[model samples]
Target: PVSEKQLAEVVANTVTPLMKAQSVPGMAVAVIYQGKPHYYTFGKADIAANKPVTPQTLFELGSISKTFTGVLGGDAIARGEISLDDPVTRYWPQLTGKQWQGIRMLDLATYTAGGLPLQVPDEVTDNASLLRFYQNWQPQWKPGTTRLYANASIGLFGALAVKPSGMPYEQAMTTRVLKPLKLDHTWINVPKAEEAHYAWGYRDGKAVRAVRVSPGMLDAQAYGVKTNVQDMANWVMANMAPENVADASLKQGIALAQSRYWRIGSMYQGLGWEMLNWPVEANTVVEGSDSKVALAPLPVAEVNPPAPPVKASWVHKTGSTGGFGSYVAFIPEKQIGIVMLANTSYPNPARVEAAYHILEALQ
Candidate 1:
């Protein structure tokens, strides 16, 4: 077991200062150490009132929501509600004979779609408008040509990916994924019961609380969920591969979602998480095609990777709204999980630097 006193000291000396250095008004961190979980909260969730954040504070999750959506789709497949052969053409049936048809529905969720753009135009409003936009969509490269992490494509893909469950994406996500895992406090919109826990988002010292998104928008697939550190810690422990799992489908779902389906040179892509063949500090914090030149086309390799790296692999995802910032990482075999939530946007490497230092000590 990790020494709580030592871990607390590291939080006080390193993690705490990292937040202070960046002037992020509020920050919440959850860590799983030596098969145990710990939470540390400091600073302010509401700056003007000087209200310190606590385990109850709900932080906005940006693209990190994609991780859940990915899991939701995989869970559906495991339950035999959907198939691995679902076609990408479901969203673009008009392109039945074109290259878009060549893209698998799974590739879109994993963000391996050819050259889909980062976001849909502001004009593409609801279901009707996006249809018109899709009517003209084209692929710059073939399916699995490479990963060009995109929100617009994945958002639509997620919307379609869960249809086999006989429910909307939001309903399926809640009933099939969240309810089973028992993360009552995590959802797209905060309920009256948990409303008191929702934290105001802060960007450049200004409070911005309207960041939570419902299920309709384009980025909703890529980013849309509100959760507190208390529940998030549970989510972390739940994702870890337990020594034994009672529900066969549940175990199968987690495995399918966490599997490293493909690798491009140094980078690997899982259902919702960005992974590395080996642990390193740079990818430790954040990653993606949006963080770089849209596509990284290597010699077209693909899978369901045979098996995970022994006990030395890592997976992480970063998220940011116009105001809030979030990052989560885990070394599954090591049984270590880290969650860093903050009110300020543009957290970049600060989260990783502190998380890297903290996790290094626990190991």
Candidate 2:
């Protein structure tokens, strides 16, 4: 049980210096404590005008959107519109070859699509280009044999999840996923009417704000998502306590998204969330002086007999774009979660350390 005063001091003592050092203009944080949501806001939402951050302020979510895509896939799977074991070619007929033959939906969703690169090719810009891009895509290894970060891999899954219903992915995302989950402010692209509340993203020093809605953007399913602390807190509650989700479809979707499905290095891979088996060397590395050694990769992504599953102790993800940085993590067992939304695009692993410290103090 933590009080607002305790949390306020923690933020001032621990978070303020980090924010100043990182040059973050503004940030918003949310925590789910003892089954309730508590918000702590800092810095500016409108940096030029000096407006303070607030619960209703919208921030671009970046790759955290990937997890939403994962859950969307799970919903489609639950509805019998798709299967993880099915080949993507089944949904998009233009793609072919033995490369895709052995690859299943889960392989792509798990980021194990046989050496899929982190992003799509430079030439892929529109719908036709996306099709041709997949048509030419070739996997370097057998499906489920490797774990490489690639937007092309998951973007296909996002598109497939909606293709069955014959609706565009954006419309499907709002109606199928956001509506079911009751996330009113989350969006693939910000609607015009909501512009006033939308925070302008910054690249630390410059406010170069933009969002990719054109079909040419290769990362629609992989990275495009925007939300506010309020909606995210609601999401955390639904994630931490699925039983409390009143909508049957949403409950089913959240369960499918979070179910740990594969092993990738030091983490367990689910649809979008990466799970870390707690009590690792992370805290020492995060808090310790030597960060490069701490940032080194944890070796594990294979197709062999998987080790028996264990509950993931820490679940979180960090995302950044040309002008924004974001992080979200939680300990479901403790009924606690944390969020950090900053205007600058600088990637600060300190966000992890900050959230960890808060959770540690709570315990």
Candidate 3:
């Protein structure tokens, strides 16, 4: 096992150059090895204010927030709050009498809900508009036959999944998921007290603040988590050892979220993550995280009898907003994980390579 200093050096060597090349103003990283976490920070989160990044500096999670919704939906299923086989119509009921029937909740969770677009249409600024868009929509492919990565699909899944809880999506997620996981620093709606710690993301070399949204937009479900490396490290730890999670239902949910559902090329789809076989190469990981995979519909092989969570595989997810970027990956068999959160949008391949390089050195 690498010592903390050795690991810290590895992380600095890997992270510094990437941040420089990407022109990221600041970043926070956590490397988990042997069930312990090593923290590193670089540059300024707010250059004018000269506020350096810290483990507690909250960065927008972007689509990485989908992973939380994924676990939340899984928890709902475990607790009988929802079921995988249930159709979206069952939750919305308004959509029940429509032609888009028989599409199961699992399809939404897996990005196999036919072919929802990459984002909710710009014209869909409210629930009514959103519903009309959905009602008028037609699937480009049969459900369960192809995977099309989309915020629209998972965003709707999250909204529908929390309906039975009687609380709004953010509140339900807080009560059911974040609270149980003890992720105090993670938020769909960051509290005012913690607002000061939120990092200013850079875009086009200018600092940009995080945007606030209304629940009606469903933006909260899709890409609105604000969290720090410390919290993210804990989240990764939870993924690595769901058995160590105290909440029974959440433990099961964690396991469920990691289970394999479909395969597109070398990448396997979990509830919210893309998985690769263990002992993976950095190039393979970079390829899997590439835009070609996320930007287009791809034929997928259903892992019927859906493979259960195992410790030998590599699971990862990459996310970005206009200003921020994030990447997370863990190797359960190795008891190692990495969280890279930066206050600037960078290429996914760059993030993957940096993380893979650091992990390879540690290995």
Best by TM-score: 3
lDDT of 3: 0.86
Q: For residues 266-293, write the lDDT of model 3, one tens digit per residue.
A: 8888888768889888888887677976
Would you give me the overall lDDT of model 2?
Answer: 0.73
Q: Alpha carbon lDDT of residue 231, candidate 2?
A: 94
TM-score of each: 0.90, 0.90, 0.97
Q: Tens-digit lDDT track for model 2 on 247-290?
A: 66666777777666665545677777767676545554254212
Superposition TM-score, candidate 1 onto the true structure: 0.90
Instruction: Name model 3 segments beyond 4 Å from true.
Output: none
Q: Which 10 successive residues of model 3 have the least lDDT summed? A: 209-218
Worst 10 residues of 2 by lDDT: 288-297
Best by lDDT: 3
Model 1 misplacement above 4 A: 90-97, 211-223, 242-245, 279-290, 293-300, 304-311
Error of 2 at 11 (Å): 2.7
Encode model 1's per-residue lDDT on 316-356: one tens digit a residue: 77888877888888887778888988888755666666777
Select the stronger candidate by TM-score from 1 and 3: 3
